[PDB]
Every structure is written in structure tokens, then in C-alpha cells.
């Protein structure tokens, strides 16, 4: 019993964190096999952050300009290439702590763990979700660039995010491990703004199922709804549309609790109209949207 | 920017998690040097039950390798299984007993394998509001200081309200609990006041100031109000501990106490603090400073 925001154990990722210094800029790198991955903005100077030409800046660099430190050992950079917004620094040593890994690009609503690092050293681990506006509400200070987002599947680390930027609203933007940004963001200091954020509906429903599995039933009602009527109500509360894929994904939780998806949707509609009335669901006075249907099943059943 | 419930990096502890099987019971053990620590309920008169066991009854598995048990002893509610091999991954560690209101990270394990890490606090009623299923016994709570892991908790049981109870690494239970199936209940819980104040400072540091007011209060008047809302008494030690946060934000502790008094008597009124409609009490003043300054391990 109990429902907590749970991160994946970070050990497999801690053994990959290195410090990358280029000139005055110091950030974190991900050392996998003989390659160190890091944000390409590590090459940027003061005069070139508004409109940097990364291809131009990188051609002027040599391998010895990149200082890579793994613990108290300096790694030797023997090559460098750029792949979208990520810099790939070929090094002379393969990381002995390299785990079984994959590079995966995630979709909004998906959750992951973040190992926040500064100077190549892990300082904390927390759970995040890719917001529908492609930002993440992280906990990042200056020096955390290159910190990674991941999930673990048996013994395989799926790297899904690398931190690059903080927007003016205090939210965060970054890329997958192939350097492709999530969202319409660019690694430039030009005026950028996070779009209006919306609640991840399928995740709120999964969390209501988690509450039912944990004994909470106060929010349940005798009503059902059509998928279209639910979406018409949901859109007015800035909730993401619920698709047939979402309904299908919620199937196992619906079978386990005996509450049809559209039946739980009618509970959510009521909660949106009424609020909680001094009550909590799983120790929260707000509807939690950073637990996916897959997280709920994993935490509740195994 | 940003404030998250953050756990310590779990790597140093992952390298210590092993599976302990005794008869039909399978749970987790902590392998430090040549000793595996686990809840004694893996084997009630525990001296009588243990005397009937031999070293070969305890099957200890570290990954896909079986360790050989060469001795066994009991220390309070923890079983210490002496093994032939010292854990090469043994980090710099201490066994520390924590106080209510202190926070720590839990590495939830099943079958000796880590499945998740989460941050939690030792409630004033000595329970933890964890997330544990059957098979998680022996999962540990810890803090990291520099390169030293301070082991502070080992999971033993779930109370009927879904909250959890356990021991320090010396086998002494937190709270008035016993490791036996009998009538046990978590006592009435209270809010960790110093932690709520630290979290209000974290909100100020992050730009959230709506709850601030011009008022101040005496420590005694604040304590009279706090007692009425099932909040722990705030001591001069707590006020002193909140000193650096008070200096950083320019808001005196008793000034922040007057904000908390108004939040208690009036509510949030549709507003939130750090994305929460409730007053969060599982961040200590040290956690807030650590997160709002980026201390690494
Ligand atoms: O966001 C950025 N940084 C930060 C990243 N994460 C958390 C931060 C918390 C406080 C201060 C800065 C933070 C550090 C690197 C540079 C920068 C500065 C702003 O201009 C840009 C524009 C684009 C890009 Cl890709 C990066 C940046
Ligand atoms: O609590 C217990 N278990 C559990 C521990 N943590 C999370 C659990 C989630 C669901 C089910 C059981 C859980 C494991 C088995 C032993 C047990 C069962 C109840 O009787 C007692 C009495 C005392 C002690 Cl020390 C342990 C137990
Ligand atoms: Cl995805
Ligand atoms: Cl302090």
C-alpha cells in the first residue's frame, strides 16, 4: 500500500556522469562506451549565444579544447562531432560502468527520472513528466546542463532527455539523446516562451485508479459519459483531450478495479466541477498528472 | 529554478542490495563488508526460532551469485548474517538513528533488486508514508553526506492504515511497534512545523510570495496556534536552524510563522505554493538549502 512519486534507482546513470569543460563553460556529459554526450552550447562564448553558428564554432575547436573529467581522472578527447543539438566527444577510454542502454524519444505525458548533476557529480534524483507543451517542470540551477532523464527496463537504461535550457517561467527545455529538442525550442538565447500548459488527462485517470486500488473511493459516482462529452468538459478545464488510445491503455486498470474508463471519466468530470471539498486523494489536494498508466501498474502490482 | 521532492542518488546503496531467503520467506538484505543485515522476521520467540536455524538455511543471493552464510546473530529486530565474501561495493557508511521530522531516501527493493527511489520523512508518530508491497521488507532508508551513506531505516511492516513501520540499522523500531502480527495502529499524526516553514522559504526563493504578510508573532503565540492545528511545537532550535533561510530571503522566522498562522486560520483560497494546495512538510531546512544551492555526491 501507499502511493509515492517514485524515481528509478540512479546507480546505472551515476556511473555515466562526467564533467565537460570548454573554455569558461562547465556542464555535465553522459559517458557511454567511448563517447561523451553533452549539450552543444558548451562550445558557446558570451558574444555568441543569441545567434550561434554551432558548425562554425565547432570547426574552430580541437580535441584538446574539450576537458572531460570522470571522477578525479581526466579523459582524453580523440574526436568530436555534432548531432543536432548534442555534442559527441569521442574519448580514448570506454566507460567500464556502461550499462545496457537505449536512446528513446518520448511523447508528452510520459514520465522519467532526472539525475540532477553539477560539475559531473550527481546531487539528486526526482521524477518528471514531459508536459504537453514539451517542457519539464524540473529542479535545475545553472551548471545542471547535460543532466539526463531516463527510465529503467529490467537492466536497460532508456535515456530520454538531456537538459539544455530554462525558460523565463522557470520551466525546462531539452533534447532526446540524438540532440532533437522536445518542443519548438532552440538552443539560442532568443526570446522563447513555453506554450500554455494543459493537464495530462490519461495520467490523472491512472492516478484515480491508483487511489481506488489503495482504498480511496469517495470520488466515485453512479455516472458514465461519452468520450466526446468528457472531452468537451475536459477542454474547459485545460485538460488534454482523451483519445481512444488512452481509453485502451487504461483497460487493465479498469478490469482490475471494475470501474469502466468512461465511468472513471465521469468521476473526473465531477471532481473538476466540485473540487475536492477539503478532502485529498492519495495525500494530494490537487489532481496528480505525473503518473502514467504504466507507472500505476508498476507501483501497485509490481 | 524549480522545487522537487528529491531523493539522494541511490547508486552507493544499490551495490549493497541482496536477496535473503529463509524457508518460504524471501526479502531484502543490506550487504556491507562481510555482513548481510535484514529484518529478523525472515526466520514469536526469535531467540528460540534462530537457535533452530543453521547457516545453510539462509540463502543469500547477490545478483546471480549465491553468497555463503558462515554465521548468524541477532541485534534487536535485525538479523546479521555473516558471509564469507566482503562486498567489494561497500561504500563509506554509518548507522544513524534519525529523529521525527527528519527526511531520508528509500530504495524500494523486491527480491534483492532495486525498483525505485523516493524521498520521505519520519512522521512525528514514527511511521513513514511509504510505498511498499509484499516483498519490500529489508528495503533501506538513507542520507548521503559527501561520500558517506548514513543508513537510517530498514523496512519491516505495513500498518492497517497503509503507513509503514521499521527500525534503524541496529534493529530498534522507530515508534511503539513490535515485529509480530498483533493489534498495532499508527498514532495520531501531526505536521512537521519546521519543515513547512523551510518549504515556505523554498517557495519564496522560487518566486512564490503571495502568502507573505507584514505581521510577526511571538514563538509562544505561534505555538498556541500551531497546537490547535495538530502542528508540532516550534522550538528555539528550529528557529536557529531556519536562520540561513531567513537571512537569504529577508524574512524573519517569526515573520514566516505569522504567514503560516494565517495560512492555517484562512486556507490557501484557491491559490497554491510550489504547485501544492497543501502545506508540504517533508523538506527539512537542510533539504531546502541543499536543493536551492546544488550540493553534489
Ligand atoms: O538556460 C540556460 N541555462 C540554464 C539551464 N537550466 C537551468 C538554469 C537555471 C538558472 C539559470 C540558467 C539555467 C544555462 C545555460 C545557458 C542558458 C541561459 C539562458 O539562455 C539560454 C538559451 C538557450 C539555452 Cl540551450 C541555454 C541557455
Ligand atoms: O507487514 C508485513 N508485510 C508487509 C510489509 N510492507 C508492506 C506490505 C504491503 C502489503 C502486505 C504486506 C506488507 C510483509 C509480511 C509481514 C507483515 C504482514 C503483516 O504482519 C506483520 C507483522 C509484523 C511485521 Cl514486522 C511484518 C508483518
Ligand atoms: Cl513515450
Ligand atoms: Cl541551514
A291 vs A127: CA distance, rounded Å: 9
Contact B281, B121 (CB under 8 A): yes
Contact A123 B295 (CB under 8 A): yes
**Method used for this model?**
X-ray
In angstroms, rounded to a whole number, what is the distance separating the alpha carbons of residues B114 and B11?
10
- Residue numbers of A between 87 and 146 with CB closer than 8 Å to B: 115-119, 121-128, 137-141, 143-144
Considering the domain B190-293 in this protein, what is its CATH number? 1.10.1840.10
Nearest CA to A241 out of A258, A223, A227 is that of A227
Cβ(A6)–Cβ(B6) below 8 Å: no
Q: Which-ligand-closest: CA of B180? A: 2
Q: At what angle do helices A293-300 and A201-213 cross, to 10 degrees?
A: 20
Question: What's the Rg (C-alpha) of chain B?
Answer: 21
Residue in chain B nearest A302 by alpha carbon: B133
Nearest Cα to B258, choosing from B207, B222, B209? B222
- A8: closest CA among B7, B72, B34? B7
The architecture of the domain spanning A1-14+100-197 is Beta Barrel (2.40)
| Residues of chain A neighbouring B115 (CB-CB closer than 8 A) | 9
Look at ligand 2, atom 26, and give the residue with the nearest C-alpha. B157
- What does the block give as the cell for A298? 508498476
Please check whether residue A10 is in contact with residue A128, taking contact to mean a CB–CB distance below 8 angstroms.
Answer: no
Query: What whole-number distance in Å separates Cα of residue B75 and Cα of residue B39?
Result: 10
Is B1-14+92-189's fold the same as B190-293's?
no
b/e per residue B26-40 (b: at least 16 CB within 10 A):
bbbbbbbebbbbbbb
In contact, B114 and B56? CB cutoff 8 Å: no
Going from the C-alpha of A61 to that of each of A43, A44, A67, A77, A79, the distances in angstroms are 8, 11, 12, 12, 11
* Closest by CA position to B297, among listed B151, B150, B149, B147: B147
Second CATH level (architecture) for the domain B15-91: Beta Barrel (2.40)
Q: Per CATH, the architecture of A198-301 is what?
A: Orthogonal Bundle (1.10)
User: Residues of A with catalytic annotation?
Assistant: 41, 145
Sign of CA dihedral A179, A182, A184, A187: negative
Fold exhibited by the domain B1-14+92-189: Thrombin, subunit H (2.40.10)
**Over chain A, what HEC string results?**
CCCCCCECCCHHHHCCEEEEEECCEEEEEEEECCEEEEEHHHHCCCCCCCCCCHHHHHHCCCHHHEEEEECCEEECEEEEEEECCEEEEEECCCCCCCCEEEECCCCCCCEEEEEEEECCEEEEEEEEECCCCCCECCCCCCCCCCCEEEEEECCEEEEEEEEEEECCCCCEEEECCCCCECCCCCCCCCCCCCCCCCECHHHHHHHHHHHHHCCCCCCCCCCCCCHHHHHHHHHHCCECCCCHHHHHHCHHHHHHHCCCHHHHHHHHHHHHHHCCCCCCECCECCCCCCCCHHHHHHHHCC
Question: Among this protein's residues, is B238 annotated catalytic?
Answer: no
**Domains of chain A: which residue ranges?**
1-14+100-197, 15-99, 198-301
| B98 class by beta-carbon count within 10 Å (0-12 exposed, 13-18 middle, 19+ buried) | middle
CATH of domain A15-99: 2.40.10.10
Instruction: Tell me how far apart the alpha carbons of residues B29 and B19 are, in angstroms, rounded to a whole number.
Output: 6
Q: Tell the residue number behind the cell numbers 545553472, with chain if given.
A: A142
Amino acid at each position: 500500500s501507499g502511493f509515492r512519486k517514485m524515481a528509478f534507482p540512479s546507480g546505472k546513470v551515476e556511473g555515466c556522469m562526467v564533467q565537460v569543460t570548454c573554455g569558461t563553460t562547465t556542464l555535465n556529459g553522459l559517458w557511454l562506451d567511448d563517447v561523451v554526450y553533452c549539450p552543444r552550447h558548451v562550445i558557446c562564448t558570451s558574444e555568441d549565444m543569441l545567434n550561434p553558428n554551432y558548425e562554425d564554432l565547432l570547426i574552430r575547436k580541437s580535441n584538446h579544447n574539450f576537458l572531460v573529467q570522470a571522477g578525479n581522472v581526466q579523459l582524453r578527447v580523440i574526436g568530436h562531432s555534432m548531432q543536432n543539438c548534442v555534442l559527441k566527444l569521442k574519448v580514448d577510454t570506454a566507460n567500464p560502468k556502461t550499462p545496457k542502454y537505449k536512446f528513446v524519444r518520448i511523447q508528452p505525458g510520459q514520465t522519467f527520472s532526472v539525475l540532477a548533476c553539477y560539475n559531473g557529480s550527481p546531487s539528486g534524483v526526482y521524477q518528471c513528466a514531459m508536459r504537453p507543451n514539451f517542457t519539464i517542470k524540473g529542479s535545475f540551477l545553472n551548471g545542471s546542463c547535460g543532466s539526463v532523464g531516463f527510465n529503467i527496463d529490467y537492466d536497460c537504461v532508456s535515456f530520454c532527455y538531456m537538459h539544455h535550457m530554462e525558460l523565463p517561467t522557470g520551466v525546462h527545455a531539452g533534447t532526446d539523446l540524438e540532440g532533437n529538442f522536445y518542443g519548438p525550442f532552440v538552443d539560442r538565447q532568443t526570446a522563447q516562451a513555453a506554450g500554455t500548459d494543459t493537464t495530462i488527462t490519461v495520467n490523472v485517470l491512472a492516478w484515480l485508479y491508483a487511489a481506488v486500488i489503495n482504498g480511496d473511493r469517495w470520488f466515485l459516482n453512479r455516472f458514465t459519459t461519452t468520450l466526446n462529452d468528457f472531452n468537451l468538459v475536459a477542454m474547459k478545464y485545460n485538460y488534454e483531450p482523451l483519445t481512444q488510445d488512452h481509453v485502451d491503455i487504461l483497460g487493465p486498470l479498469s478490469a482490475q478495479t471494475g470501474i469502466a474508463v468512461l465511468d472513471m471519466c465521469a468521476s473526473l468530470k465531477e471532481l473538476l466541477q466540485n473540487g475536492m471539498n477539503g478532502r485529498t486523494i492519495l495525500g494530494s489536494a490537487l489532481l496528480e498528472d505525473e503518473f502514467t498508466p504504466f507507472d500505476v501498474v508498476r507501483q501497485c502490482s509490481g
